[PDB]
DNA sequence: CCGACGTCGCATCAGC
DNA sequence: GCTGATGCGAC
DNA sequence: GTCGG
């Protein structure tokens, strides 16, 4: 459906989810609205109150409200008040800054420190994270191309083959449902030793060595968190790469394949029949037991013990 | 009326 | 020192 | 904020 037919009511709506949870940190008034504007861009006409929206799940009596203050005015004065509010908008200005979430952005802004420029000057009241997140501010906005992800993807299997080429890598995220641009890079892992550390560092260490992985957020015995830079220059990147045990792995691959909206709808489903899916594994209900893990083989397992017909990556964008 | 609302790895903090 | 809590980025 | 036991 055409953006312009609700639009600015799913745009008042998200901006709400974004002062509830950068702001007055009420986590599930942001996924409240975040639901609400989800519900309302899928609905194909035009809405006139807030009556007629509020017949949508997860709609209800305040948003509706609000609705019918925005259909008779263009918007909203508790919005158009935050907005040109300082500390608020700057708390919340703040948050775009990848490793800065709501209790940090409070603590700078309490103090003085309000934008990139403040954030520049103060370097050292900044964690690791924040540094490579303020150093990246723009770069971490722009979105990937597919051309670049499959170069970058090159990189990738090229030199996890190389380590060793006994290791299994499959890129997941959008790029694997054929998306046309993507927001990052997230690479699963596995090994044929490896079921229920050297592992993960040694690939790390690789991408580093070429010079593909530029700088790091985070590195555990399971997940890197990073950030990388195809060969001249092209913005930085953030790379996630996790190393899976070899009987989790296909659920691994399904989970960071998602979508969101996708694997809900799967896990629902899912519980209709009598099983649980999580990362990890999926399970038998029992009384409501979730009993031992089955075993996996490829993402189709899956499908089956749900009976659900396999879905392409393509198709699974809800 | 009032509790649920997704779940988890890593970095860093508070506290003993 | 250590453990357990909390912030944060994530389908 | 919305939903539902
Ligand atoms: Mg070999
Ligand atoms: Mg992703
Ligand atoms: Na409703
Ligand atoms: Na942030």
């Not at 409070?106 to 964690?127: A, H, S, Y």
């Not at 699963?188 to 592992?199: A, E, G, Q, V």
């Amino acid at each position: 459906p055409q953006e312009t037919l609700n639009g600015g009511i799913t745009d008042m709506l998200t901006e709400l989810a974004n002062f509830e949870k950068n702001v007055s940190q009420a986590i599930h008034k942001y996924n409240a609205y975040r639901k609400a504007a989800s519900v309302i861009a899928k609905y194909p006409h035009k809405i006139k109150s807030g009556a007629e929206a509020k017949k949508l799940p997860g709609v209800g009596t305040k948003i509706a409200e609000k609705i019918d203050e925005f259909l008779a005015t263009g918007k909203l004065r508790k919005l158009e008040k935050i907005r040109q509010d300082d500390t608020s908008s700057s708390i919340n200005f703040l948050t775009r800054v990848s490793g800065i979430g709501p209790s940090a952005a409070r603590k700078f802004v309490d103090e003085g420190i309000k934008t990139l420029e403040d954030l520049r000057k103060n370097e050292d009241k900044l964690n690791h994270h924040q540094r490579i997140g303020l150093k990246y501010f723009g770069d971490f906005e722009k979105r990937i191309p597919r051309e670049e992800m499959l170069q970058m993807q090159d990189i990738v299997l090229n030199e996890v083959k190389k380590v060793d080429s006994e290791y299994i890598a499959t890129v997941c995220g959008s790029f694997r449902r054929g998306a046309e641009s993507s927001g990052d890079m997230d690479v699963l892992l596995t090994h044929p030793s490896f079921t229920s550390p050297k592992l993960l560092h040694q690939v790390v260490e690789q991408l580093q060595k070429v010079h593909f992985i530029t700088d790091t957020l985070s590195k555990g015995e399971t997940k890197f968190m990073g950030v990388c830079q195809l060969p001249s220059e092209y913005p930085h990147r953030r790379i996630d790469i996790r190393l899976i045990p070899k009987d989790q792995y296909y659920c691994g691959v399904l989970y960071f394949t998602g979508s969101d909206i996708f694997n809900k709808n799967m896990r629902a489903h899912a519980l209709e029949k009598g099983f649980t899916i999580n990362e990890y594994t999926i399970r038998p209900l029992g009384t409501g037991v979730a009993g031992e893990p089955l075993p996996v083989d490829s993402e189709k397992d899956i499908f089956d013990y749900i009976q659900w017909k396999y879905r392409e990556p393509k198709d699974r964008s809800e």
